[PDB]
Design a protein around this ligand. Structure first.
Ligand SMILES: O=P(O)(O)O[C@@H]1[C@@H](OP(=O)(O)O)[C@@H](OP(=O)(O)O)[C@@H](OP(=O)(O)OP(=O)(O)O)[C@H](OP(=O)(O)O)[C@H]1OP(=O)(O)O
Ligand SMILES: [Cl-]
Ligand SMILES: [Cl-]
Ligand SMILES: [Mg+2]
Length: 134
């Protein structure tokens, strides 16, 4: 079930899944439609679901990681697609080898130095590239 803010933006949550508290490398996942492309893992908030809960849930589903939820980085809109994503830091403390999306759709994941994450997100997911700006 998709949920929506009162303005009709689909509600989403995501995490910047960093390898360590140094926040130098982040985990991206492949696009579900176009697997040669990378994205920040995230997805729809469910009804009555806290965003931090959704974020953590989605990165579990899409990236197969768990960790220490850190700060909310921010709330990011994609105007073209009409969705609004709460983006948290998550310091990955657990990397699961098989996860929901790896199994169901063959989703991939890869660590990128922040600057390289930005680079590969830029073309198709520039909003996501912007998650890293600060
Ligand atoms: O079809 P796209 O290019 O517009 O992007 C796709 C994006 O695909 P991706 O970024 O992987 O290429 C999906 O992401 P996902 O399939 O990787 O999860 C994402 O779904 P979502 O992340 O919002 O939702 P869930 O993760 O499932 O809860 C949305 O797909 P959906 O129509 O199945 O809910 C998104 O579509 P829009 O929100 O309409 O932009
Ligand atoms: Cl790191
Ligand atoms: Cl986006
Ligand atoms: Mg998703």
């Amino acid at each position: 079930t998709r949920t929506y803010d009162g303005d009709g933006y689909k509600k989403r949550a995501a995490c910047l899944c960093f390898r360590s508290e140094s926040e130098e490398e982040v985990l991206l996942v492949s696009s579900s439609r176009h697997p040669d492309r990378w994205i920040v893992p995230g997805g729809g908030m469910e009804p009555e679901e806290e965003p931090s809960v959704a974020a953590v849930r989605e990165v579990c589903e899409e990236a197969g990681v768990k960790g220490t939820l850190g700060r909310l980085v921010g709330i990011f809109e994609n105007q073209e697609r009409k969705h609004r994503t709460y983006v948290y830091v998550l310091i990955v403390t657990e990397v699961l080898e098989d996860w929901e999306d790896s199994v169901n759709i063959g989703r991939k994941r890869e660590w990128f130095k922040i600057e390289d994450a930005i680079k590969v997100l830029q073309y198709h997911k520039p909003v996501q590239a912007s998650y890293f700006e600060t």
